[PDB]
């Protein structure tokens, strides 16, 4: 991701998301959700 006078930094990264493995019906219903899960 990205890392931002005084001795302080702030790191930025994408959120930690785990699509490792019910929800199969949710992914078939919504192509937007299936898109990120593949």
């Amino acid at each position: 991701g990205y890392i931002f006078i005084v001795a302080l930094k702030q790191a930025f990264s994408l959120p930690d998301i785990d699509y490792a493995d019910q929800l199969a019906a949710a992914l078939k219903r919504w192509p937007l959700l299936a898109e990120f899960a593949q």
């Binding site: 790191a11 990264s13 785990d18």
Partner: protein, 242 residues
């Protein structure tokens, strides 16, 4: 600890949650300072500050004055630092002042070191300005506020969150098929989601119109109880310094 609260998107409940969480922490005996870092200067209205009261830390700073005189006492354990009211010209020229506010950082860092407050909460706007990044860097911990909908779902896959942020669901209400699908998917996949959420609650819609934090407005509201669960979690998990 300094705790930042920032919406993943605008309008997700960040300011109402900041006011409510500050109220809950002070109910638990903590001395709290709540700082409004949003140029819209809305936080003060949850604390019965008159709309025409224009003073604030950034107002005073842009006027060549001491930001330390812009503070307000709500209770003996809750102080408020409003942003101040900007003119229309200042609102539409954020580049003019977004770079002239960095001295608030050493002022807050000094206020932190003094131990006067157990908690400093900062309501952070949904932007990437210099001053937002600066104030974010002062935070020991931060919460990223979401609502369960397709827009927030997309944002969690494309925008950076502050490192170490936890995700807090607000405005939750069961019965929407797509929202329940997103939520069950987040439960299995979003590794930094908090274990409690805040339901849609009319107390949270009314309290701003009553100009109070939700727990003062309706202590027995479900949302007020959920914010208290959040405050207890913060005492347990977020009291360490960075």
């Amino acid at each position: 600890a300094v705790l930042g609260l920032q919406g993943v998107r605008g309008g997700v409940g960040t300011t109402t949650i900041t006011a409510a969480l500050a109220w809950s922490l002070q109910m638990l005996g903590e001395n709290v300072l709540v700082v409004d870092a949003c140029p819209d200067n809305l936080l003060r209205l949850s604390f019965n500050v008159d709309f025409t009261h224009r003073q604030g830390w950034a107002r005073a700073m842009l006027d060549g004055q001491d930001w330390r005189d812009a503070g307000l006492r709500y209770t003996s354990q809750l102080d408020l630092l409003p942003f101040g009211q900007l003119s229309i010209e200042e609102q539409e020229n954020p580049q003019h002042w977004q770079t002239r506010l960095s001295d608030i950082c050493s002022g807050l860092q000094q206020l932190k070191a003094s131990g006067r407050y157990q908690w400093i909460l900062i309501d952070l706007p949904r932007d990437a300005s210099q001053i937002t990044h600066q104030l974010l860097s002062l935070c020991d911990h931060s919460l990223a506020i979401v609502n369960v909908d397709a827009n927030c779902h997309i944002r969690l896959h494309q925008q950076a969150l502050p490192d170490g942020a936890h995700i807090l669901i607000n405005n939750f209400r069961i019965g929407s098929q797509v929202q329940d699908d997103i939520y069950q998917l987040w439960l299995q996949s979003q590794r930094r989601l908090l274990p409690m959420l805040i339901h849609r609650d009319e107390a949270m819609a009314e309290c701003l119109a009553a100009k109070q934090p939700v727990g003062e407005y309706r202590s027995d509201a479900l949302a007020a109880e959920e914010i208290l669960t959040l405050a207890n979690w913060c005492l347990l998990n977020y009291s360490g310094l960075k």
